[PDB]
Amino acid sequence: GIWGVDSAQVVTDQLFQCVRTELGYPKFWGRYLSEVPNVSEGLTRDEIVRIRNYGVKVLPIYNAFREAVGYANGQVAARNAVFHARRLGIPKNKLLFANIEDFFAVDAAWIAAWVETLYPTGYRPGLYADPTKGDFAAAYCEAVSRNNQVAVQAVIWSAAPRPGTTKEQKAPRYQPAAPPCSANVWVWQYGRDAEVCPVDTNLADRRLLDFLY
Template sequence: MRILNWGVDSAAAVTETLHQCVRDNFGRPDFWGRYLSTIPNVSDGLTLEEIRFIHDNGMKVMPIFNNFREAVGARAGAVAARNAIFKARQLGIPEGTFIFANVERFFLVDSAWIIAWVETMYNSPYRPGIYADPDEGPFNEAYCAAHAANNLVGEQAVIWSAEPELGTTTKQKAPKRFIPSRPDCDANVWAWQYGRDAEECPIDTVLMENRLYQNLF
């Protein structure tokens, strides 16, 4: 039987207030997805103090890198990965942790960027993840072109799917079936953001396979 772990992600820092809001309204997350970089009006960057707070409350951290606005070209893909690696090292994120590139559905995406992200992460202490929408936007075509061009993409990259959106739920009422949308080619789709923009707290709700959960920190 597939073991699933439930958690949330947020652009806002995990404070006592936000954590209590999630606990009261949704349940205790197994993990919390957080962005590595501070971007004005977009995301609070993860801090060492926040990592300690998350760990002290019995959760793992799912690191997300979002300091880019399009995913085009090999050079840009390698630069994004190097910047993510630098931030991860600054925060003491342990080797073997997956770091997810935040590729939004409205981004321009090409196969060269995906290959460079995967190769650069693969040659670092960290592992390549990509948050993306296989249903809307150009990711599906770009990913499958990258998969056909470079074996590392299919072997090493893990996809965190943004579809389908079923709506946020409590931990107890999370989907029992793990049915994230997948690219049209083979892909390791191990996480699913099934609910976005909860009304009660500024979070999204996420399910992931235990094999990914074990490679968070």
């Protein structure tokens, strides 16, 4: 596994140096496409320039939605994610991850819309989710049965299991939970809220990196 982090807040030089010196050198950094009050700080072009200046890949996340039900709703989410990605200058054939928290309602139609709406934009669909708690895994597997391209195109960032944050050199073997059907489970959030720095810790399959900016 390749090691990285994610954060609700902007990557300033101060936060990068905290991570670099207290945890390890992140190869990727999960960040949010838009501002959600009390929840996430959005990306800016200036921040992307800095992240890339460190040789770190941006892992973009769309989280301006609180439920993941319905085809039309999934289309709106995808269209908004792409709008923000373009505004930020994220190039085509890069992943955009939908933030599906474990307590959200989720259905197969929403997942289908996320995937299908993204395809002609050139962005690739990502799904951040917990395959072990809540509706995601069944919704995903139904979507795959209905259209195998869900499994071909989508990349999953799994939020389980969660043994806890570590320094990079202490990270566990790559072992994310997966849904019980075909998937590309290429990212794993193995710990949340590291406390020495206000970040979560992740591991990835190296195929991820070619789909990050």
